Amino acid sequence: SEFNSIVNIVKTHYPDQEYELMENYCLLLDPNTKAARSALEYADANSFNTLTDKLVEKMSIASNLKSKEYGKIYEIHRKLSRGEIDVLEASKNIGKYRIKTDEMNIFSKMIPMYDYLSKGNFSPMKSLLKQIDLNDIKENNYLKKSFETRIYVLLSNIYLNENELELSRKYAEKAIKSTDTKRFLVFSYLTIGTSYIFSDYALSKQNYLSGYEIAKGNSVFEEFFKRNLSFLNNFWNKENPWINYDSNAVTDVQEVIFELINQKKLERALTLLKSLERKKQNENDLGFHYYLEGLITNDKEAFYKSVEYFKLSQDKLFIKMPLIKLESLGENPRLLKIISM
């Protein structure tokens, strides 16, 4: 099709000027056209926000009915991603709108799962995913492919959080085969590394470094690796050149703390941890916060709170961390396994 052909040539013959050429081309397409519809998903799937936003504004005041719906549904997704709205506000706007497109009906169920994943709320994510059939789509084949990759990466993160890690890798490797879009490969590799964080140190670093190379240049994608490598190395007590000492973000400060413990500077770690407790953070965050306090004080109550927050978050992978500490402090292994399952 026009868009697919355009993109495939830009990629194969001008790979290094893809954004510059596609940005210009996509912004000169007529809002009402099938190509302008394919263009909006390209911009959002590649996380080209400034472009996606210009495309949404132009296609929201459009005459084609499919082009106007796309802009309206994505407008909510862009507001949820930018942090202007709540997952429930978004869920309300989706029920209010009457979606006539089978395509903007599958995207509607995915729009919330992205906020759910970002804020440690994994509980509501798996059910929505089962309301999606990509055979209900037949007019755009560019989207069905992009939505197909989008679902595999979401399904990998869902299986990762359920401790079904063989299924997580299978769905991330499927996505890596299904696409050439950078964000999907970057998030596929990141999910594979997090799936090996306890199983195999080497394979976690190999898949995290494979993603870091693809992300290189996108500072926002790079940061996901610098954070996870930083974590991987602090858990296996290894040299960690991936720590950001300049960031105030909770998840970053948590990595500075995990290093001070590995270096046995507990007084500075507990001071920095205590200042974090007052700060706004999700339930998943607090599972890690109390795991760190337990490593400094060896208080079983801290490991218990870690277990509690991981339980709320519904994180069946990272709950293993406090569970293992409790095993080594001679807590009953059978009870620890029931809390894991």
Place this chain on the structure above:
Amino acid sequence: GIVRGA
């Protein structure tokens, strides 16, 4: 802590 994305 760890980070996730899709």
